[PDB]
Design a protein around this nucleic acid. Structure first.
Lengths: 86, 86
DNA sequence: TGACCGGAAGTGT
DNA sequence: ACACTTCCGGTCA
DNA sequence: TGACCGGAAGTGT
DNA sequence: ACACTTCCGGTCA
């Protein structure tokens, strides 16, 4: 499972916005409300308990040149799926 | 992703027990608090909006002979992972 | 002074 | 081959 | 009278 | 080959 797919799953599956939330769903923009918790969970998808936001954020940065995800400048922990979140 | 893996993910990732919850964790027993919602989400993992509990429960029944999951008799919506999770 | 950035080497399939 | 993972030195507000 | 059960045929990789 | 998915007739409490 890829990081972007996982993020999409969390946004779809969480019952609330305590750890992740759409900021502007129309635009595919979302915020990692509890970045370290989202990272913990991401690491656990690979059976690791040590994933943190510094490493997950780097993975997201790796997406910039792939035109998969981009940063929403000026807003902390907010990112944007460039290809409509379907 | 398999149904049992998905269930394990929900139990690990949900911030509360509004749709799924461990009943006796060391025993690997859990309850589908909102069975139809858990089913909806399961279907969406495969890009389908029509998965319901009747079909998901059948998938779980298919697990009985595989010694992966068993029913916790006498309790509605409660099942048991036979192989230690966490 | 914390979030964000990107190079460079390593991991697991 | 590919999708990150792991470090981490440096920038920006 | 709803949750649970299991046969039998079909789907997608 | 495998892991369900889809129907659904019947049981149990």
């Amino acid at each position: 499972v890829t990081l972007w797919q996982f993020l999409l799953q969390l946004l779809r599956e969480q019952g609330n916005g305590h750890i992740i939330s759409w900021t502007s769903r129309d635009g595919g923009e979302f915020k990692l409300v509890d970045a370290e918790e989202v990272a913990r969970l991401w690491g656990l998808r690979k059976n690791k308990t040590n994933m943190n936001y510094d490493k997950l954020s780097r993975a997201l940065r790796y997406y910039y040149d792939k035109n998969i995800i981009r940063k929403v400048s000026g807003q902390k922990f907010v990112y944007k799926f460039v290809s409509y979140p379907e």
